[PDB]
């Protein structure tokens, strides 16, 4: 097997800040999507990250993962900045997920701003070579050039942009609390993410 860092994905909670997706529902969906992928693929590790130790989504996911008896060597939560996992967290993760916007543009606050700021213009060049847009519930894997400061400092080799459902009425494709559709699309976003990650590993 390759090194563990090469088989580790760190991801943030998609859709639950700027996109205002309900945390209780999101946490159920995270744990179900994680359980589903770990049932299929060996030798991967998944790490849910959020910036604050008071994170409500981390607390919910921990509770639910314990109830569901998810294998805690293969999935766990971690407090940290997704762009500083090795340097500040002490945890090397080669692949990270981004909660993107549909046009795959930098900025916009949230984790998307942080990732593009850390990665620099290399990520915008590389992303434009892979895809021009995302639709909700889908993702795209982008190899991160070795010249990127994020690669040099944190060992990140790939970023997977993911577009989750949007519940925020001041953002594109707002679902107006259609959580039937919303829940399906967030399930799809996580499965798409995890499948892209597995396709990088194997
Ligand atoms: N540096 C970080 N490290 C780890 N987690 C973070 C970080 N920054 C935020 N989070 C967590 O990341 C999680 C997701 O929060 P969001 O980034 O709003 O994603 P969304 O899918 O709701 O909105 C996407 C839109 O916002 C974007 O700007 C795009 O431009 C889109 O327009 C939360 O748990 C955060 O606490």
TrEMBL record:
Residue span(s) of domain Macro: 62-202
Annotated coiled-coil segments of the chain: none
Listed name of the protein: Basic helix-loop-helix, putative, expressed
């Amino acid at each position: 097997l390759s090194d563990i860092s090469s088989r580790t994905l760190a991801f943030p909670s998609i859709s639950t800040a700027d996109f205002q997706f309900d945390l209780d529902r999101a946490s159920d969906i995270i744990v179900d999507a994680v359980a589903d992928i770990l049932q299929k693929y060996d030798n991967i590790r998944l790490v849910l990250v959020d910036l604050s130790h008071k994170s409500r989504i981390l607390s919910l996911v921990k509770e639910k993962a314990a109830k569901k008896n998810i294998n805690s060597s293969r999935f766990f939560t971690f407090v940290g900045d997704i762009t500083q996992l090795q340097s500040k967290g002490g945890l090397r993760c080669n692949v990270i997920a981004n909660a993107a916007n549909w046009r795959l543009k930098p900025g916009g606050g949230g984790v998307n701003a942080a990732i593009y700021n850390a990665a620099g213009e290399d990520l915008q060049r590389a992303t434009k070579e892979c895809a021009d847009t995302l639709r909700p519930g889908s993702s795209v894997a982008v190899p991160l050039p070795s010249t990127s400061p994020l690669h040099q400092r944190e060992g990140v080799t790939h970023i997977i942009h993911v577009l989750g459902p949007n519940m925020n009425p001041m953002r594109p494709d707002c679902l107006k609390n259609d959580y039937t559709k919303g829940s399906k699309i967030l399930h799809e976003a996580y499965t798409s993410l995890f499948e892209n990650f597995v396709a990088i590993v194997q």
